[PDB]
Amino acid sequence: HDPESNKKRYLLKDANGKKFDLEGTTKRFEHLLSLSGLFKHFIESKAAKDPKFRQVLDVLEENKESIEFQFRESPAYVNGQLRPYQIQGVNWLVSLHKNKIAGILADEMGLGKTLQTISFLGYLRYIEKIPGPFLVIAPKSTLNNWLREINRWTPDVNAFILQGDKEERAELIQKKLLGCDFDVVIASYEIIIREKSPLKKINWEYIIIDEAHRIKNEESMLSQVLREFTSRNRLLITGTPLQNNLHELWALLNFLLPDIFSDAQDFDDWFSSESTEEDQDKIVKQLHTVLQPFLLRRIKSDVETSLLPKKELNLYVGMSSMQKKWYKKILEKLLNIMMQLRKCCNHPYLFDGAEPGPPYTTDEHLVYNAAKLQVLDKLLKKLKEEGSRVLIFSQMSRLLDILEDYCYFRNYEYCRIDGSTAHEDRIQAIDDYNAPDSKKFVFLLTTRAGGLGINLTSADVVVLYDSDWNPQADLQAMDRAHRIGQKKQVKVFRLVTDNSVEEKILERATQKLRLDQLVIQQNRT
Amino acid sequence: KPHRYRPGTVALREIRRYQKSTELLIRKLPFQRLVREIAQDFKTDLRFQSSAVMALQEASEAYLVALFEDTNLCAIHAKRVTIMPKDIQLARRIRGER
Amino acid sequence: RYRPGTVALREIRRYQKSTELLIRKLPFQRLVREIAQDFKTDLRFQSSAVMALQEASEAYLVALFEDTNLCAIHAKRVTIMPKDIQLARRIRGER
Amino acid sequence: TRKESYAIYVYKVLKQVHPDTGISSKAMSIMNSFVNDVFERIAGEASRLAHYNKRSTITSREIQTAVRLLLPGELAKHAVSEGTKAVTKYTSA
Amino acid sequence: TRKESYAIYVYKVLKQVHPDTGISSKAMSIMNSFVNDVFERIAGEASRLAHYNKRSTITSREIQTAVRLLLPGELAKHAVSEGTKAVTKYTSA
Amino acid sequence: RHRKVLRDNIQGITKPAIRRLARRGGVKRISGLIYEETRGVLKVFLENVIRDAVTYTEHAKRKTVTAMDVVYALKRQGRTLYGFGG
Amino acid sequence: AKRHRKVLRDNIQGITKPAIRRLARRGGVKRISGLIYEETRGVLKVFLENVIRDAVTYTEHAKRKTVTAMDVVYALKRQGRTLYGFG
Amino acid sequence: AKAKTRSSRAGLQFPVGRVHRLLRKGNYAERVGAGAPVYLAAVLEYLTAEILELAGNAARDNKKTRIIPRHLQLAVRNDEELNKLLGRVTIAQGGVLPNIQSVLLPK
Amino acid sequence: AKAKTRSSRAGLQFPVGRVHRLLRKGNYAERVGAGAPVYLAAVLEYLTAEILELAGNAARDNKKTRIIPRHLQLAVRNDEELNKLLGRVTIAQGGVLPNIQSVLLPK
DNA sequence: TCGAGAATCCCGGTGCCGAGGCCGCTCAATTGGTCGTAGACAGCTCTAGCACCGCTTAAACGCACGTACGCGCTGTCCCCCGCGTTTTAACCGCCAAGGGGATTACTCCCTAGTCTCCAGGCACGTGTCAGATATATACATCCGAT
DNA sequence: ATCGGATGTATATATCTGACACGTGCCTGGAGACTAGGGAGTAATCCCCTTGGCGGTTAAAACGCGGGGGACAGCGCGTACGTGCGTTTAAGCGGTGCTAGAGCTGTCTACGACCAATTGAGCGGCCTCGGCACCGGGATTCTCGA
Ligand SMILES: [Cl-]
C-alpha cells in the first residue's frame, strides 16, 4: 500500500464510530449458543434492561463460514520452522477469528510465546490479505524484544516502538501515526495512557495486549481507556490468568467479549455464592464449559521435558524470645496495621529501637534476635559444602538490608536487585552473578521485582524467606530460577512461623492456589 | 554574549505571574509528611482524610502569603527592597502572634 | 538645664507606673456626646458609660503607640511619625 | 444520606441577576458555607441581644438590630429595607 | 433588684489562698467580670461541641473538652485535674 | 438639654495628652505631625464604638446610654473590658 | 551499618527554597534574603502545631481515630481564620 | 384549603420554613417569632444576590460564563463593604488580588 | 432530712446550684448533665485561685494588704499563658508593664 | 539614542467531563385547632442625669534657643539574582489485606426534666476601725558643666 | 574625676473612707416521687485510609558561577525637635435645683407551642452535551545593548 490508502481506511469515517452493530452480535450469539446452551443465563441477564438483545435471542432461538483451514506446518512467510503445538495454537487463533470472537492465550511463560502471535499476524496479512493496523501493548522492558522478534521472523512489515520523550513521541506520531505509515504499532502501557486521543481516532483491527493479567481490575485507568478504544476484535496474552480470585477472570472476559460476559453478578453467582453440598462440586465446576472455548493453556511438562520439577518444602520455625515480647506488645494496645505482625514474624530489628544501645554493631547477636534467620544460617552453612548458590526472596527490601549485613558479617558475596537500583546496574549485576565463574555466593531479590526478563538460571536453591498473599507472585519468583535453562534440581524452601499470622497467610494462599487449580488446571487439557 | 535580563526584571515577571493564578505553591507530599509527623506528637495512630490535609494546606498557604505581604510592607517602610528575618519578626509582633 | 532625652525618659518611667487617666474627663465627655448626636438625637449618658469609653480609648491609644514605637525603631530612628502609625494600623488589620 | 444545602436557592437568585451565567461546584460549596456563616452570625447576635433584655422570644426586631450591628455601611441599610419590605408583604398576605 | 454576683465565693477562695489579704470593690468587680466571661466562653464552646456531635445534652465530657480546647497548656492540665477529682468526690459522696 | 451642640471638640484632645499617652507607650521622641493622626484614629474608634452602643440603646427602647451597653459594644468589637459589668 | 536506614532529610526541609520563593512572589516581594528560608519554616511549623492541636482535640472528643476536614474547619474557625469551601 | 408556601407569600426565594426550623432547633431562644424567618430569609437573599452580581460581573470581565472561586474572591476583595464583612474569611482556591508596590517597579 | 449542698458534697467553694441554673436558663442545650456543673465550678475555682494568689503575691511585693486592679494587671501580664488567656482583655484602672526599649536608653 | 530577541496574547481547532435538566420518592412544611402565658400597655415612684454658678489653681499655650538627629550623598564590598546543567523526588498508576466510620435499624434502661414543699444561703441594710492616702522632711542618688 | 543641683525615695503623723462584720427575710436550691426519651449497645454494609512495595515520566529541585546593584557604613548639615519660663484659661470640685425616664407592679390579650393529617417541595440518581482546558503559530510588545 501507500500512505494515502492507509489514510482513507484507518481514520474513523464518522464522528461517533461507536454504535451497536447487530450482525456481529447475532453471529456471536448463534455460534456460541450452537456450541452450548448455558449462555441463555447471560443472555436473559443482559436482556433485562435492553430488549433488542432479547429479540436477537428470539430470532436466533425460534429458528431451530469458519472454513476448516487447518493451517498446517509453518508457512514460508514466517522464517524457519517451529513447534507443532505452536501450529496448533495458531489454528486455535484462526478458528477463533473465523468465529468472530476473541480468546485468552494462557501458554506458560517461556513456551514459545508471542511467536504464535507474530505467525498469526502474518496469517492475517497473507492468507486473509488484510493489512494493519495492529496495536501491541507490552511492558516497556519487552518493547524492543517484540520489535526484534517481528523484524527477524517476518521482516517484510512495518513496525515501530512509540517510545521517547514528549517531543520525540509527538513528532513520531505526526510523522507515522497521523502519517499512516505502519502495520503494527509497538507501545507500552504508560504510553497507551499518555497517547489516548491520537490512538482513539484509528479503526483498529486487533489490540494485542501482552501480559494481559495487568488488565484484571475494571476500575483501572488502562481498562477504561481500552474500553474507549474502537476495534474490530481483541486478543489477550498472559501466563497467569485468575491469579487470586474468580472475579478477575470475568474481568478478563468482559474486555475480551463485552457482549457475552456483560454482567459481573451473573458470573459471581454462577458458582461462588453456593456452598452447601455437591452443588459446590462436580456439576457446578463442570459448568466451567463456558470457559472452555475462550482459553488455552499449555505446561512445561508437555513440551520441553527437561527441568526436573520442584521440591517445595516448609520450615516451621519457632517464635524467639525477643520476637515473643514484641509480638505480645503488638497484639495488645507507629503501629497502625496488622502488617506489623508479619514484620515481627520476619525479624524484630525492623522495628526501631530493637538493636540494643545502640552502639552500632553487626556481630553474631543478629541471628540471636531472629527465628527464621537462625534456620537460614544453618541452611547456608550446610549448603556451602555443596556450593549451591542461593536466591533469597522477601517482601520488604528493608528486610533485605538486614539480611545482606548478616551476609557480609559472615563474609559472603551478595548482589542486590530492588526497586531503587536502576536498569543498567541491574543488567551488569545479573551479568556478574551469571558469570561462568562468579564469586558471589548468594543473590538477593524482591518477590514482585525485576519484571520477567531476569535469567537467574545459574543457581539451584531458592528460599522464599517470606510468603505472599498471591501464590502467583511466589510462583513467578520460583520459575525465575526454574525456567528453561537451569538443569540441576531446583530446591525451594519456604519459611513459616508457627502460632503466628504467617499460618493464616499461607492458608489463604493455599485456598487461592487450589481455586486456581480447580478452575483452570484440570480442564487445561 | 547571549541575552541576559537585568536583576529584578524576572522577579517582577514572576510576581505578576503568581499573583494571577490560583494553584497551590507547595508540593502535596512534603506537606502531608510535615503534618503527619507534627500530629504524631499530640496523639499517636491518626488517620488523615485527604480533604483534611487539603484544608490544612489551603489555610497554611493563605497564612504565609498574608504574612509575606506584611513583611514586604515592613521592608519597604525600612527603606529597603529585600526582606529579612527582622521584618517577619516585626510583622508577627505587631499583629499579635508574638 | 537637662539635655534632650532625660526629661522624656523620666516621664516614661513616671507614666508607665501610674494608673490614672491621661485625658481630661470633661473634654473627653464633650467629644463623646458630640460624636453621639450624629447617630441619634437628644441622648443622655451615664457617668460610668463615659468612664468606660475613656478607659477603652486610652488603652487603645497606648497599645497603638507601643507598636508605632517598634515600627520607628525598625527603621533606625527614635522619632515616631504618621507613616509609622499608618504602617502599624495597616498591619494590625484596621486599614 | 440526605444532606440539605442552599444550592437550589442560590441557583435561583443567580438566574435572576445574571439569567445566563452558570456556577461551578466549588463556588457552590463556598456559597453554601457563606450563607451558613452569615446565618450563624445573625442568629447568635440576635440570641445574645434577646438575652440582654431578658426577652424569651427572638423576632424581627432583634433580627433588624442584629443585621444593623453585623453589616457595614450601605449594606446594612439596604438589607434592613429589604427585610422590612418582605415582612410587610408577608403580614399583608 | 437583688443583683447576684460571685463576690461571696471569690472572697472565700481568697481567704483560703492568702489568709490575711483583702480585696477592693473595683478588684472584686473585675474578678466577677472575669468569672462571668470565662463561664460564658466555656459554656459556649461546650454548646458548640454538643451541637457539632448531634448530642442534645451538655455533660462533663463536653466541659472537659471545652476547657482543654480553651485554656493554654499547663493551665488546661491543672484545670482538668481539678475538675476530675471534684467530680469523682461528688460521685462518691 | 440646653446649649450642648458643639464643634471642633476633637481639639480638646490636647497635645500634652497625646504626649502623655506616648510616654505610657514608651515613646521618647515625637514628631510634630503626629497629633492630627492621633486625633483622626481616636475619632474613628469613638465613632465605631458609639455607633454600636447607640444601636444597643435604641433596641432596648431606652434613650440613655448605659455602661453595660458600652461594654456590649466593646465586646462585640473584640475589646472585652473588665470592671464595669458583665 | 546499612542495616540502619540512613536518617532522612528533616520533614521541615520539605518546604524547599523554591516553594518559599513562590509564596513570597505571590505575596509580592522582589528580593529575598537567605535566612527567610528558615524563619518561614519556623513560623509555618508553629502555625501547624496550633491548628493540629485543636483538630486532634476535636477528633478525640468525637471518639474517632480520624482527623477530618470538618474538624480542621472547626479548629480554624476557633482560631479565627474561617475557611470557605470545605464544609 | 390549598397549600401556599411562606416564601411565596413573602415574595422571596429562600426557604422561610427551613430558616424557621433552623432558628427553632439551633438553641438560640426559647421560642422564635413569626416575622423573624421572613426577615432573615430576606437578608440572606439580599447578601447572596449582591455577592453573585459582583461575581458574575467579574466572570464577564474575565470572558468566562461561569462563576469560579477566583471570581468570588475578586468580587469580594474589590468592594469595601464586602471585604470588611469577610475580612477574616479565606476563600479556598481564591488567589490574591494583583498588587505590586510602586517603589518595586523599574525606574 | 437536712439538705447538703452539692458544692459541699463535691468539696468545692463555688456554687454548683447557681452554675446549674445558669447552664439551664442560658440557652446552651436542651438538657444538662449532673456532673457538668460540678466540673465547671471546679474549673472556675481553680482559675480564680491561680490568678488570685498571683495578685496576692504582687500586693505583698508592693507592701500593700489589699488587692487592686493594678495588682491584677501586673499578675496577668507578668504570668505567661495567663496573658495568653487574657490576651484581648482590658483591665480598667490597670496599666502597662514597666518597659523601655533598649536603643532608647542613654549611652 | 534604535534593532534583536525573548515573552505574551490572541486566533482556531479539538476533546472531555461537570452542570444542569429530568424523574421518582418521602418527609418536613402547611393547615386547622386548642391553650397557657410572655409581653404590651397603663400606671406609679423616685433616682440619676442635666444644667448652671463660683472659685482656684494646675495644666496649656506661646516663645526663645541650641543641639542631636533625620536625611541626603558617596564608596565598597558581598550576596543575591539570572542562566546552565545535572540529579531526584513528586505524581500517577497498581497490589494486597485489614480496620474505621458513616449510615440504618432496632432494643432498652437510667438519668434528665417536671411537679410539690420547705427551710437555710445569700443578698441588702446597717454599723464600725485600720489601710490607704496626704503632708512634710531628711537622705540617697543620677546628671551635667568644669 | 569632682562638685552642685534636682529628683526620687524612705519615714513619721494625721484623716478618712472604704472594706469587713453582723442581723433579717425571702426566695431559690435541695429532697422526694414519677416518668419518658435520649443515649448506649448491637449488627449489617459499603466505601475510605494505612503500610509496605514496584515501575515510569518528567518537571522541579539542586548546585555553580558571574557579576551587578543594593545594604551598610561614614560624613556633613540644617533643621525640627526638646527644655524651660511666664501667662492665660479652663478643668475640677462643690454645691444647688428640676425633672424626666428607668424601673417596678398588675393584667389580660394575642400569639407562639404542640399535636394530627396531608401533601407538594426538595433530594438522590442518571444522561447528556456545551464550556473550558489545551496546543500550536503568528503577531504583538517589552526589555536591553547601541
Ligand atoms: Cl514469554
UniProtKB/TrEMBL annotation, chain B:
Keyword Acetylation part of the UniProt annotation: yes
GO MF annotation, one: structural constituent of chromatin
Domain Core Histone H2A/H2B/H3 stretches: 7-94
One Gene Ontology cellular component: nucleus
Keywords: Acetylation, ADP-ribosylation, Chromosome, DNA-binding, Hydroxylation, Methylation, Nucleosome core, Nucleus, Ubl conjugation
Places the protein is found: Chromosome; Nucleus
Record family assignment: Belongs to the histone H3 family.
Subunit and interaction comment: The nucleosome is a histone octamer containing two molecules each of H2A, H2B, H3 and H4 assembled in one H3-H4 heterotetramer and two H2A-H2B heterodimers. The octamer wraps approximately 147 bp of DNA.
Protein name: Histone H3
Organism, as annotated: Xenopus laevis (African clawed frog)
Complete-protein stretch covered: 38 to 135 of 136
UniProtKB/TrEMBL annotation, chains D, E:
Molecular function per GO: DNA binding; protein heterodimerization activity; structural constituent of chromatin
Domain of life of the source: Eukaryota
Main location: nucleus
Any Gene Ontology CC annotation: nucleus
Domain called Core Histone H2A/H2B/H3: residue spans: 1-69
Localization annotation: Chromosome; Nucleus
Keyword presence, Nucleus: yes
Swiss-Prot/TrEMBL keywords: Acetylation, Chromosome, DNA-binding, Isopeptide bond, Nucleosome core, Nucleus, Phosphoprotein, Ubl conjugation
Family classification: Belongs to the histone H2B family.
Quaternary assembly: The nucleosome is a histone octamer containing two molecules each of H2A, H2B, H3 and H4 assembled in one H3-H4 heterotetramer and two H2A-H2B heterodimers. The octamer wraps approximately 147 bp of DNA.
The protein's name in its UniProt record: Histone H2B
Organism for this UniProt entry: Xenopus laevis (African clawed frog)
Chain's gene name: LOC108704303
Shown segment, full-protein numbering: 33 to 125 of 126
Automatic annotation (TrEMBL), chain F:
GO molecular function term, any single one: DNA binding
UniProt keyword annotation of Nucleus present: yes
Entry keyword set: Acetylation, Chromosome, Citrullination, DNA-binding, Hydroxylation, Isopeptide bond, Methylation, Nucleosome core, Nucleus, Phosphoprotein, Ubl conjugation
Keyword Phosphoprotein found: yes
Superkingdom of origin organism: Eukaryota
GO biological process, alphabetically ordered: nucleosome assembly
GO-annotated cellular components: nucleosome; nucleus
Residue ranges of domain TATA box binding protein associated factor (TAF) histone-like fold in the record: 11-76
Main localization, broad class: nucleus
Compartments (UniProt record): Chromosome; Nucleus
Family: Belongs to the histone H4 family.
Subunit structure comment from the entry: The nucleosome is a histone octamer containing two molecules each of H2A, H2B, H3 and H4 assembled in one H3-H4 heterotetramer and two H2A-H2B heterodimers. The octamer wraps approximately 147 bp of DNA.
Function: Core component of nucleosome. Nucleosomes wrap and compact DNA into chromatin, limiting DNA accessibility to the cellular machineries which require DNA as a template. Histones thereby play a central role in transcription regulation, DNA repair, DNA replication and chromosomal stability. DNA accessibility is regulated via a complex set of post-translational modifications of histones, also called histone code, and nucleosome remodeling.
Protein's name in the database: Histone H4
Organism (species): Xenopus laevis
Gene: LOC121398084
Span of the entire protein shown here: 31 to 116 of 116
UniProtKB/TrEMBL annotation, chains H, I:
Record-annotated Histone H2A C-terminal domain positions: 80-107
GO aspect biological process, one term: heterochromatin formation
GO MF term (any one): protein heterodimerization activity
Major localization class: nucleus
A cellular component annotation (GO) from this entry: nucleus
Domain Core Histone H2A/H2B/H3: from-to ranges: 1-77
Keywords tagged on the record: Acetylation, Chromosome, DNA-binding, Isopeptide bond, Nucleosome core, Nucleus, Phosphoprotein, Ubl conjugation
Superkingdom of origin organism: Eukaryota
UniProt keyword annotation of Ubl conjugation present: yes
Compartment(s) of residence: Chromosome; Nucleus
Quaternary structure (record): The nucleosome is a histone octamer containing two molecules each of H2A, H2B, H3 and H4 assembled in one H3-H4 heterotetramer and two H2A-H2B heterodimers. The octamer wraps approximately 147 bp of DNA.
Function: Core component of nucleosome. Nucleosomes wrap and compact DNA into chromatin, limiting DNA accessibility to the cellular machineries which require DNA as a template. Histones thereby play a central role in transcription regulation, DNA repair, DNA replication and chromosomal stability. DNA accessibility is regulated via a complex set of post-translational modifications of histones, also called histone code, and nucleosome remodeling.
Protein family: Belongs to the histone H2A family.
Name under which the protein is recorded: Histone H2A
Annotated source species: Xenopus laevis
Positions spanned in the full protein: 13 to 119 of 130
